[PDB]
From a paper:
Archease is a small (16 kDa) acidic protein that is conserved in eukarya, bacteria and archaea. Here, we show that Archease and [name] from [name] do indeed function in unison, and that Archease affects the catalytic properties of [name]. Archease expands the cofactor specificity of [name], enabling the efficient use of dGTP, ATP or ITP. We also demonstrate that Archease accelerates the RNA 3′-P activation and ligation steps of catalysis by [name].
To gain greater insight into the mechanism of Archease action, we solved an x-ray crystal structure of [name] Archease. Archease crystals diffracted to a resolution of 1.4 Å and contained four protein molecules per asymmetric unit. Archease appeared to crystallize as a dimer of dimers; however, sedimentation equilibrium results were consistent with the existence of a predominantly monomeric species in both the presence and absence of Mn(II). The structure of each subunit consists of two strand–helix–strand domains, each consisting of a three-strand core and a single helix in a strand–helix–strand configuration. The crystallization buffer included CaCl2 and the omit density map showed two Ca(II) ions per asymmetric unit, with each Ca(II) ion bound to a single Archease subunit in octahedral coordination geometry. The metal-binding sites are identical and consist of two strictly conserved aspartate residues, the C-terminal carboxylate group and three water molecules. The metal-binding site is located at the interface between two subunits, subunit A binds a Ca(II) ion while the analogous residues in subunit B are not in a position for metal binding. The N and C termini of each Archease subunit are proximal, and the N terminus exists as an extended protrusion that forms a beta sheet with its partner subunit. The Ca(II)-binding site resides at the base of the N-terminal protrusion on the protein exterior. The electrostatic surface potential of Archease is dominated by regions of negative charge.
Residue numbers in the entry: 1 to 143
């Protein structure tokens, strides 16, 4: 037989997606999804808070920036987060996001650690108002 080769389909990273009644709630929800890649997010208690503020020229960059700062907090302080309060406004020609992130220190016995997220990316990123008036935010982070 002559040697032969092929490509085949396999999972590549993982998709995260949030839905909400508002853009802000979709951002909150997809951030929960992000932490559920790393731990069982349902096991994360709200003991500590960190605040985020970022500006961007468009909503995609805003979402990237928000999630990447959450990842950085996670990487530096070892915090994991359960929920978020997000506010998005227009200020002097930019989008401004402010958020409160609620969570606690990683607990290896309790949080059911899964896999770390290496980086937020723009891969498959989409933010949209669906025909039914709900909002969706998604992306495929690098794991
Ligand atoms: Ca990867």
């Amino acid at each position: 037989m002559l040697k032969k080769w092929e490509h085949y389909e396999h999972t590549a990273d993982i998709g995260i997606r949030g839905y909400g009644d508002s853009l802000e709630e979709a951002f909150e929800a997809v951030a929960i999804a992000l932490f559920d890649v790393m731990v069982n997010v349902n096991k994360v208690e709200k003991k500590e808070v960190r605040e985020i503020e970022v500006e961007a020229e468009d909503l995609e960059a805003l979402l990237y920036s928000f999630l990447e700062e959450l990842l950085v907090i996670h990487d530096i302080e070892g915090l994991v987060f359960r929920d978020f309060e997000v506010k998005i406004e227009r200020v002097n020609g930019k989008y401004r996001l402010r958020a409160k992130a609620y969570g606690e220190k990683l607990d290896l016995k309790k949080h059911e650690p899964k896999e770390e997220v290496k980086a937020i990316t723009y891969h498959d990123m989409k933010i949209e108002r669906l025909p039914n008036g709900k909002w969706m935010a998604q992306l495929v982070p690098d794991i």
